A paper describes a structure:
Proteinaceous microcompartments, called carboxysomes, play a critical role in CCM function, housing two enzymes to enhance CO2 fixation: [name] (CA) and Rubisco. Here, the CA converts HCO3− to CO2 to elevate luminal CO2, promoting Rubisco-catalyzed CO2 reduction. Correspondingly, microbial and biochemical studies have established an absolute requirement for CA activity within the carboxysome The α-carboxysome contains a highly divergent β-CA known as CsoSCA, characterization of which has occurred exclusively through the isoform from the chemoautotroph Halothiobacillus neapolitanus. Our results show that the Cyanobium CsoSCA is allosterically activated by the Rubisco substrate ribulose-1,5-bisphosphate and forms a hexameric trimer of dimers.
To understand the structural basis for [name] activation, CsoSCA was co-crystallized with [name]. Diffracting crystals were obtained almost exclusively in saturating levels of [name] with the final CsoSCA crystal structure solved through molecular replacement to a resolution of 2.3 Å. The resulting structure showed a homohexameric trimer of dimers consistently arranged in the asymmetric unit with P212121 symmetry. A metal ion is evident at each apex, coordinated by a His3(H2O)3 octahedral coordination sphere, comprising His155 donated by a distinct monomer. The electron density and coordination geometry are consistent with a zinc ion. Density corresponding to a HCO3− ion was observed at one of the trimer apices. While variations in omit map density at these positions were observed, given the consistency of this density across each chain, the dependence on [name] for crystallization, and the observation that [name] was an allosteric activator of CA, we were confident in the modeling of [name] at this site. Most notably, [name] curls around Lys469, mediating multiple H-bonds with the ligand. The Cys2His(H2O) tetrahedral coordination of the catalytic zinc ion typical of β-CAs is maintained, and the overarching active site is highly homologous between each CsoSCA isoform. Manual inspection of H-bonds within the protein identified a network linking the catalytic Asp246 backbone and the Arg266 side chain that, in turn, binds [name], mediated by a water molecule and Leu249 backbone groups.
Numbering used by the authors:
A (entry chain E): 117 to 577
B (entry chain F): 116 to 577
């Protein structure tokens, strides 16, 4: 184990990942047992009892009570079980805080203070929406989830104009509430773009939004970063700038690489500092020195004289990522066998606050189907290979955040969910009519830290 | 025959502008009829261009005229083409000549920003109904310099409450960082106005279609959104944030406004109001100076409860302005618009058009995607089946998206947005489209400058 790895953290995170993934993967084995029993006299009783033992909840009775006519409707049970499993999963995230990083947690308070010391008053991260990066924040960089805005997008192509609007909203809160700090204080908004690549099969397992070309994914991520900065500098008077960070992550090993920037965001696309070289460089050092050597390495990999706080923060991410490297060596032989797509359901809408595990969710950002149906089609094709290949429906969970202070915003969000549902049912009528596609509608009040809310389903009784 | 408060020079200028722009669209059909009668003449392509330049000021597409002999004169395309080119010319004249004399930096806009600040308001954000009979409410009905107000038309005056909260935040941010319009600590409020409409000559049928032509429901739905916005701002920010509200309606037969004067905190009676027609009658035999004081006293007593002094000052100036438009309609339109219903020349889709300030020029449908604007665009398309399709002419559609020129790659996002909308429209009206009865022009406009909108695509190709 590396002298800088948090052993027990690695165990706790492993215990979490295996627990949630077990809940989802126990479904098929249970449904296989039930299918064998559907002609027995006490079928309904024995099925309810199997499901309680195994999944911890019971099944919709109408589907069991009528299995003798049509036969037992497995496609609908499977979707329903995935939805129910997602609800229990999500509710327990807000209830138990498995990551120890909710608002007000010691970890979150600690990191908020550390970000301020480094010269940053907000940390806004866009990873590619790829399911293989959903654990980037909690596992890959070991940051409390609540100390961070996470804004995922296919190929890390975030909305430049909406990010400027988030900068404006952030400054305004500094002006009126001095939250997180006074407006006059010499801190900067920090925008990060996290792309990914595959070290084991770079040609086919890379970022599919950019044809699995590492250079294209790195350079489009930077193009957006620059454009955001240029946009702030052009739209407001006086100082008016932001800090930038372009990072990638290997989906085979979870090692990150940082393009350490100069003070003004000068980034080189062809030179990076890979956490694996960091890992090997500090492996024989006692902890205190190893931390020093990570510092000097990040300093030395800067594109031009770097900002001191940027050097400190990047060194912390390397220090943090070294644990995740050991994580994948411990529990995944140094390379995930699910090198590609193995997600358990599709998520569409706004990013899921509670989803922080690798290959759990295929996320497609969209305000409307009319836009980013391309990104949704990609997932649907993927789940044709994962689920329809073996007779199982494609499960979709729609999510929209709303401001639970705006009167009627919750109502607006719910109706937004049904607007998406109608559009999905229209886009794939073959699958929807063959019962090979179902949607769950969830809304989440983003003004406090409570669980999302299930507001409708294609499964109807 | 003229009210002491009426501004006769302003009335003449605004009449000259409305007249010239409606004449340009109204010449299209008579020109096209003349070309149709000439289509067999040996010199037809030459004659057609010459007439087209003399009468309309732009040329017609060669290939339409060139092939008239085999495939027949394609009037459908010609007509759409001419509406688009006319839209183009008058749109750029608006930016180039400032017919309303209200562009940024104009004397008229300077004065009205000072007056607004003086009344206690640092921003006037108005949502009229998107109905094309209200497009002139700002520049004509209220004689407000267009550049010093935010105009956000929506069907039924149902503006986006969350986005308005975001506008308020953007506004506050400018105040903090730049002191524009004023320093953040100054004691001014953001003012959101909802402007509904109704028809006094046919209430049952010519009112707001979004609300079933039901005046009381149009008024109460506008009020409801205003209160929601106010409740959103108060509940979303510390330290007693608030905003002011104003509900008013305009009568589309006579251009007379009526105001539900509110008390300090926004308290508004729906069931009663102050009609500009009664304010007109009540000041008519008074010198200009007493007429104004009288207007102020009438606003004052009309309030639902004790009003804010600054709000009284502003509403009385809006009444003073509206009195000129009341006289405008009475002298140039017999006192009742002869086109009481819809007579728009084209459908506008997307973001509201900065440059459209004439009555019955544009049926406007707000939308960022067709997936969400469909119902509203259906209504406009239906209206145009009566206005145009019924007589063989296409439904012309101009798409517009504003974009922040200061944001790199934003124009290209707007163009791509326009293309997405074109594709969607074409899919939703597939008969009209392949039958050549629906065309669309794509327009974008940099809202970070005062410059003409740019044409970026068209369903008329060769
Ligand atoms: O970026 C995030 C979380 O990203 P993700 O949801 O993808 O984890 C936001 O800061 C808040 O969570 C949004 O609202 P709220 O403050 O209620 O959480
Ligand atoms: O979009 C602009 C800026 O355009 P520009 O400064 O280039 O004219 C307006 O501020 C609002 O859209 C309000 O509409 P209006 O000003 O027509 O009331
Ligand atoms: Zn990707
Ligand atoms: Zn209306």
């Amino acid at each position: 184990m590396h002298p800088l790895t948090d052993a027990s953290a690695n165990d706790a995170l492993h215990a979490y990942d295996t627990a949630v993934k077990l809940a989802f993967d126990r479904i098929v084995p249970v449904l296989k047992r039930l299918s064998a029993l559907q002609h027995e006299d006490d079928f309904v009783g024995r099925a309810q009892a199997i499901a309680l033992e195994e999944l911890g909840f019971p099944l919709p009775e109408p589907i069991l009570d009528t299995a003798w006519v049509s036969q037992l409707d497995m496609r609908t049970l499977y979707a329903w079980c995935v939805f129910e499993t997602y609800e229990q999963t999500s509710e327990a995230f807000f209830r138990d805080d498995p990551l120890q990083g909710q608002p007000g947690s010691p970890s979150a308070e600690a990191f908020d203070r550390f970000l301020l010391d480094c010269g940053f008053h907000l940390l806004d991260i866009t990873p590619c929406a790829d399911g293989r990066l959903a654990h980037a924040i909690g596992f890959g960089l070991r940051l409390p989830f609540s100390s961070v805005r996470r804004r995922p997008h296919a190929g890390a192509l975030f909305d430049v104009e909406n990010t400027v609007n988030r900068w404006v909203k952030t400054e305004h809160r500094r002006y009126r509430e001095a939250q997180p700090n006074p407006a006059h204080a010499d801190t900067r908004y920090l925008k990060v773009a996290l792309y990914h690549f595959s070290s084991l099969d770079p040609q086919h397992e890379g970022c599919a939004a950019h044809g699995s070309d590492d250079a294209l994914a790195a350079s489009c991520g930077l193009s957006r970063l620059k454009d955001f900065q240029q946009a702030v500098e052009n739209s407001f008077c006086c100082g008016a700038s932001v800090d930038l960070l372009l990072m990638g992550i290997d989906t085979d090993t979870d090692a990150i690489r940082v393009h350490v920037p100069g003070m003004d965001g000068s980034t080189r696309l062809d030179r990076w500092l890979d956490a694996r070289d960091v890992y090997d460089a500090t492996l024989g050092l006692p902890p205190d020195q190893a931390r020093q050597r990570v510092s000097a390495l990040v300093q030395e990999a800067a594109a031009s004289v770097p900002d001191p706080g940027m050097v400190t923060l990047v060194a912390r991410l390397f220090e943090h990522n070294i644990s995740q490297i050991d994580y994948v060596r411990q529990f995944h032989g140094g390379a995930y066998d699910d090198a590609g797509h193995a997600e358990r359901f599709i998520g569409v809408g706004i990013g899921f606050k509670e989803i922080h595990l690798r290959n759990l969710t295929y996320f497609a950002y969209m305000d409307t189907v009319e836009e980013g149906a391309a990104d949704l089609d990609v997932g649907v094709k993927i789940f044709k290979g994962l689920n329809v290949s073996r007779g199982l429906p494609v499960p979709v969970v729609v999510r929209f955040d709303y401001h639970g202070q705006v009167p009627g915003a919750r109502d607006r969000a719910v109706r937004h969910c049904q607007r998406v549902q109608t559009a999905i049912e229209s886009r794939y009528p073959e699958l929807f009519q063959q019962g090979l596609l179902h949607a769950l509608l969830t809304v989440r009040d983003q003004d406090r830290h409570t669980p999302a809310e299930a507001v409708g389903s294609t499964i109807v009784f």
